[PDB]
Design a protein around this ligand. Sequence first.
Ligand code: CLA
Ligand code: BCR
Ligand code: PQN
Ligand code: SF4
Ligand code: SF4
Ligand code: SF4
Lengths: 69, 62, 80, 30, 151, 732, 154, 42
Amino acid sequence: TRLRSKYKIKYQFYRVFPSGEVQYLHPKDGVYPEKVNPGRQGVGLNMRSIGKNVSPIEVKFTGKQPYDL
Amino acid sequence: PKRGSKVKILRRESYWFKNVGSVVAVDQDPKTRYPVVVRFAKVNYANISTNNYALDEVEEVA
Amino acid sequence: SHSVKIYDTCIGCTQCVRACPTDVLEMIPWGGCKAKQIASAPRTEDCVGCKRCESACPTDFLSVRVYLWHETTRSMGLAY
Amino acid sequence: MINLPSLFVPLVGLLFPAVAMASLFLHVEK
Amino acid sequence: FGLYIHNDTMSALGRPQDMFSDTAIQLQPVFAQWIQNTHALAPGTTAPGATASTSLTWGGGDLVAVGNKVALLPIPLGTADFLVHHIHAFTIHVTVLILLKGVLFARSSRLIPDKANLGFRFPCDGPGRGGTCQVSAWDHVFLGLFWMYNS
Amino acid sequence: ALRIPRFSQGIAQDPTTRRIWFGIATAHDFESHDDITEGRLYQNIFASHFGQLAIIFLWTSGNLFHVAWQGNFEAWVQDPFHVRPIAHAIWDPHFGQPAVEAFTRGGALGPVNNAYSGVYQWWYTIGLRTNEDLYTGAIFLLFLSAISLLAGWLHLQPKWKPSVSWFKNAESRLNHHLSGLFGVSSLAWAGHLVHVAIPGSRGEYVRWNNFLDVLPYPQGLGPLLTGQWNLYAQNPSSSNHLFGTTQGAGTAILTILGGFHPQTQSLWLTDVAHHHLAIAFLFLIGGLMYRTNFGIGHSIKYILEAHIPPGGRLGRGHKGLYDTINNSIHFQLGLALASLGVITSLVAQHMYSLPAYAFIAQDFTTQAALYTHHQYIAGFIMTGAFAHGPIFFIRDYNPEQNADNVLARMLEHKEAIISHLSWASLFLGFHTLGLYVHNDVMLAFGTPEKQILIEPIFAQWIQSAHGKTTYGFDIPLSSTNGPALNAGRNIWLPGWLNAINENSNSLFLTIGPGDFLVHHAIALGLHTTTLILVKGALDARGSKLMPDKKDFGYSFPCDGPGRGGTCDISAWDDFYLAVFWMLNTIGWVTFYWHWKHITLWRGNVSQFNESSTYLMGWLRDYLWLNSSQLINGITPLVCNSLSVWAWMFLFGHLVWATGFMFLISWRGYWQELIETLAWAHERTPLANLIRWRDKPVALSIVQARLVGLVHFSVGYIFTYAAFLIASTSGKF
Amino acid sequence: DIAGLTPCKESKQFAKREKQALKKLQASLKLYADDSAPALAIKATMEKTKKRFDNYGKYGLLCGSDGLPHLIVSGDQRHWGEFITPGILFLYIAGWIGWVGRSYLIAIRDEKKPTQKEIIIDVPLASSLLFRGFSWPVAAYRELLNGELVDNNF
Amino acid sequence: MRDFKTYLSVAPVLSTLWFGSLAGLLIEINRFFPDALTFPFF
Ligand code: CLA
Ligand SMILES: CC1=C(/C=C/C(C)=C/C=C\C(C)=C/C=C/C=C(C)/C=C/C=C(C)/C=C/C2=C(C)CCCC2(C)C)C(C)(C)CCC1
Ligand SMILES: CC1=C(C/C=C(\C)CCC[C@H](C)CCC[C@@H](C)CCCC(C)C)C(=O)c2ccccc2C1=O
Ligand code: SF4
Ligand code: SF4
Ligand code: SF4
C-alpha cells in the first residue's frame, strides 16, 4: 500500500525461510483480504452474539471440556 | 404500525438503550438479526452512531 | 494465539474493518446482514493485537482487545 | 576452634545467591 | 552519578578513611585551571592588553569586589567540579536522544513501520505486539520535557 | 519452540523474558491454570497454607533463639527501662572501624540493631526473664516447624488425603471450628496468663518442673467447681508492690477490677487472666451452634430463605446466598482479609491505648515501631480485600444462581453506592479542605486572629462518659458521681477512671482543635479509597465501555487506542489506584500521631494545638523540624548510631522516586529503543559469538505499573519507616 | 462558655498575644510615621484591628487557649447559629442555582434542539429562571415530590 | 429587548466574565463588613 501514494499497484509476497515454503496472502491467490469470493472457511464467532456477557462460569476444570472455545 | 416511533431498546446488548424513542426505519428482507434500524440524537464512542438491532428487546411503553 | 472474542454484523467495509497490519482477514459470503458478510479471522496467527480492527468496525459492546497470554514472537512482534 | 559465625553471611549473600542466580539461571534452564 | 551514591555508602557506611571527595579521591593541586587561568596571562601579554583578566571569575588571585559584600572572584573548581558537571555532562545526553531515538524513528519507526497513519500526537497503538505505547514523538516529547525540568 | 517451564503451554513455550516475569509473577494463580481439577487447587492451598505456618514458626524459633546470644536480657534483668531495645548483631564487612563509633550500643560488643519489635515485653509478660529458660521457645517453635510440615509432607498424600466436600461443608469447618480454633486455645493460655506468670509476679522460680507442688492459690481447685469464687478477686496484687517482686505482692489469681498502677504503666498481670477465660463461652454458645453429625444444631439455610428478614413484605428475598460463599472460595479471601481487615485497626490502638506489658506507653518507640506497621496491614489487608471482591463476579458469580437475592440486586441498583461514595467525598473534597486553606492564607498574611478553625464539638461526648473528667460542661455520669456511672459505680468503674487523664496514660487522648481537621480528612480518605475499589470491584463486573470484561477477566493490561475511549481497565488496575489513595489515606493518619504523641514525650504539646490548622505547621514543625539529627548522623564528620536512615531514608528517597519511570514512562518506548541496541550488541565483533538464550523485550504494561508498585511503596513503606525511628533516639 | 474555652473577656491570651502579635508592626517607628504611603505600616490598619480590639470582643466564639476563635455551632446556647444563623443561607445560596441549573437545561430540550444551545446561553438568567430561586422550598420545593419527579415529564 | 426571552447569548467568556465584573462584589461586601468571622443578621 506504500505503493498507494504514487499511484502504483499489484504487491505480492511470500515465504521463504529454512527451508522455503509459505507464508503469504497475495498471491497465494491475492484474495485482497477484502473480497470475499470463493470458499473461505468458518471460525466466525461466539454462540454469544455478544450482549449476553457476564460472569462466565461454565469452567471448573474443563477437560476434555473447553480449551476451547 | 410503529415504524420509527418513540420505541424502546431492551437487550443485554446496547449503549443507549433504555434511552427512548426513535426506531426510524424497519426492513422486510429476512435473514440476520438486524431488522430494527435506530437513530436518535445522543451518541456512543463513534459519532455517526445509529448501529443496528432486534429480537429480544422492545419491552416498552408508548 | 489471539483474543479473546470479538463479534458480528459489519462488513462490508468502505467505512470499517479494512486495516489489520498483519492480515487476519478474509470475508466469507454467508447469509444474514444486508447483502452477505460474517467475520473475525480466516486466520489470527499473523496478527498481533494490531487491535486497530474496530476503529473501522462498529457494532455494539466490546469489539476488539488482545489477550495474548502465550504471547508470541510471531506477534509479540520482536523479530530481531 | 573459635571466632565466627561469619560462616553464614558470606553464604546468605555471597555464594548462596551466587547459587540462586546460578541454578534457577535457569528456572528456564533450571 | 553512580558516584555520589558510593560516597554516601561511603560517608554513612564510608568512613572518611578513603573515598571520592577533595582531600579524598584527590587529586591534589587540582583540579586545574584549566584555563581560565591563562585567561590570566591573557591580558598582560597574549592578546596584548585589554584590561584586568577578561572576567575576574577566571584567572589567578588578582581579586576584587566592592559594596562590602563580594562581587566576583577566582571561583576555584576541583573535585565537586569534575563531579556534578559530568551530570549536566550526563543528562544533556539521555535528555537528547529522546529526542534523537524518537526524532529519527518517528514516521518509520522500526516497530510500527509506517507511522504517518496516526498524526503528530497520536496516542500509542497496540495492546498487541505486546505493549506498544508512547511511540509518537509528540509523546517522545511528552517526556522529552520531564527530564529538562530534571536537567 | 522453547518447551519449558510449566503450568500451561501458553507462556511456557513463549520466547521472551516474559516467562520469567510471567512465571514468577502469576505463580500462585493456579485457580485458572489448566492443570487443576476441582481438587488440585483446594488440594494445593492446604499443604501450601500449612507450608508457611512453617516459617512463621521458624520466624521466631530463631529471633527467640536469636536473643540470649545476643542480646542482654539475662543481663537486662538487673534493671529494666533505658534503653536501646536490642535486635540482632550485624556482620557487615563494609563498616568503617568506627564500628565502635558505629553501633557499640546497649549491651553490644558489636554494632547491634536497635530492636523495636515490642515483643521483648510480650516476652517478659507470659513469663520468662531467664534466657537459660529461653533457648526453648526456639526449640518449641521448632517442636512446631518440622512437626507441621508433616501436615505438609504427609496430609499432602492421597491416602491420608483431603477431599473437596470436607472443604465445602460449612457447619463443621466453622461451628465446631470456633470452639477449638480460639476457645480451648485461651484456657491454658488464659490460665498460663494465670498459673505460670503469677509466681514470678509474686517472684518464684515456678518454671515448668515444680508444676503441681506450687498451688499459687492457697484453696486448691475448689470454689471454681462449687459455686463461689470471690476468694480469688480477693486482695489484688497491691498499690506499690514493685512489679514482679516483693512487698505488696497480694496473692489472688483471676482478678478483674484494678488496672495499671503507674509502675508497670501497663494492664496488670492476671487481670486479663479472667479476660482470657470468659471470651470462650462467647463462642462456646454459638460454638456448638451447629454440628458434627448428631441431629441437633444449625443448618444456616432458612437462616436465610426464611430469615432474609430484616426484609420482605417486599424487598429482596434471599432464597440462599451460600452456594456462593461456600462455592466461591474468594469470600474465604473475600472476608478473611476483609474482616481480619478491621481487627488490624481495632488492634491499632487497643495494644496502645492501654498497652499490655513491661512498659511501652512511655517508650515512644513502640508506638513509633509496633503501631504503623500494625496499621499498614490494616492497609495491605484491609485494601486488596475487596479485590477478591470483584473476583467472584467475573470469576465465581453466576447472575442466575443468585438474581433473586441482595447481591445481584445490590448490583441491579449498584451505580449508586458508587455515586454517594463520591458525593461522600467531593465534600470531604472542598470543605475539611476549603476552610482548611485560610487556615494557611491568614496564617501567612499576619491574620491568625481571624481564622476558620472550627473546633470539634462531637467526639467530645464520649471520652468523658467513658470516664474522662477534664474541664467544663456540667452534665451527668463522669460527674464523678453519675447515673450511667451508677448502678455500676465500682464494677469496672473506679480504675479505668483512676488513670483517665494526665497523658502518661494516653488513654482517650487530650482532644485538640483541628483534631478533626485530620479526623475529617481521614473520613475523606477512605470514601475515595473505596469507590475505586467498589468499581475496580463492583461494576468492574462488566461495565458498558467493554460490557464483557466479564470474559476478559480481572487482570488485562490496558487496551490500546480502541475507539479513543479506552484505557487502563483491569479491575486489577483499579486496585491499582485503590492502593494509591489508601497509602494516601495512610499517607495521612500517621502524620497525626507522630504529630500528637511526639508532642507529649518532650512536654511540648504546642507541637500541635498551637500549630496544625494550617499545614506548614505540618510541613514546618511536623515535617521540617526534629530531623537533621538523623540526616546529620552522616553530616561530613561521622555516622554516630543514627547513620542508617541517613542512608535508608534517601533510599526510601531513591527507591521511591524510580517507581516513576515505570509509571510515567509507559510501554512502546522501551521495546523500540531496546531494539535499537538489542541489535547494536549483535554486530560488534569479539563480543559477537554470544547469541543469548531468549530474546530481550520491554514489559507488559501491567508490570510497567506493578513494579511502579514495589519500588514505590517499598520506598514509601521505607523512610517514614526509618524516620519515625530515627528522630526518636535523638528527641523523644 | 462550653467545653473550655473562655468567652475572651478574661483576655489571658488572644487579647494580649493579640496586643502583641499586632503591635510590632506597630513598632514600625522603624520608619517615619506622619503622613505616608510610603509607610503607614504603623498608624492605621490597627483601626480595623486595635480600633476594633475590645470590639471584636464581643460575642465570644469562646475563643480559646492560644487565645483564638474555636468557632462553634452544634445546636447549643446562643451559638446555635455562629455558623447556622449563617449556615442555612449557603444551602439556600446554592441549589436554586440548581433551578436556573435545571430550568436552564429543562429548556435545552424546549424550543427543541439542544446542547451548545448551552454554550450560547440565550442570556439564560435575571428573573424567574433565577428569580424563582428566591422562592423554592416549603412553599414549592416539592416541585420535587410530584409531577416533575416523577418523572412523569416527557 | 423582550420577553424573558431567551434574548441572545454570547460565546466562551460568559461563565468566566461572571467571575469578574459582578462576582468581585464579594470583596466589596467582605470589605463592607470587614472580614466576616461569623453571623451579622439585620
Ligand atoms: C465502605 C466501607 C467500609 C466500612 C463499612 C468501613 C468501616 C470502618 N473503617 Mg474503614 N476502610 C475502608 C472501607 C470501609 N471501612 C477502606 C476501603 C479503607 C482503605 C482506605 C479503609 C481504611 C480504614 C482505616 C485506616 C481505618 C478504618 C477504620 C474503620 C472503622 C472506624 C470507626 C468509625 O466508623 O468512626 C465513626 C463512625 C460512626 C458510626 C460515628 C458517627 C455516627 C454518625 C454516623 C451518626 C448517624 C447515625 C446514627 C445516629 C449512629 C448509629 C451508628 C453507631 C455505630 C454509632 C469503621 C468500622 C478505622 C479503624 O479500623 O478503627 C481503629 C481506621 O483504622 N478504615
Ligand atoms: C429524623 C431523624 C434524623 C435524620 C437522620 C438521618 C440521617 C436519617 C436518614 C433519613 C432519610 C430517609 C434520608 C433521606 C434523605 C433524602 C434526600 C434526598 C436528601 C436530600 C436531597 C437532595 C439530594 C436534594 C436535591 C435537590 C433538592 C431535592 C432541592 C434542592 C435542589 C436539588 C434538586 C439538588 C436526625 C438527624 C434529626 C436524627 C433523629 C431522626
Ligand atoms: C525501565 C522500563 C522498561 C525496561 C525494563 C528493563 C530494561 C528491565 C531490564 C532488567 C533490569 C535491568 C533488571 C534489574 C532488576 C531486576 C533483576 C529485579 C528482579 C529480580 C528478581 C525477581 C529475581 C520497560 O520495559 C517498561 C515498560 C512499560 C513501562 C515502563 C517501563 C520502564 O520504565
Ligand atoms: S469487524 Fe468491521 S468489517 Fe467485520 S463485521 Fe464488524 S464492522 Fe464489519
Ligand atoms: S489484533 Fe486486530 S489489528 Fe491485529 S490482525 Fe487481529 S483483528 Fe487485525
Ligand atoms: S496502556 Fe498503552 S495499549 Fe493500553 S490504551 Fe493506554 S496507550 Fe494504548
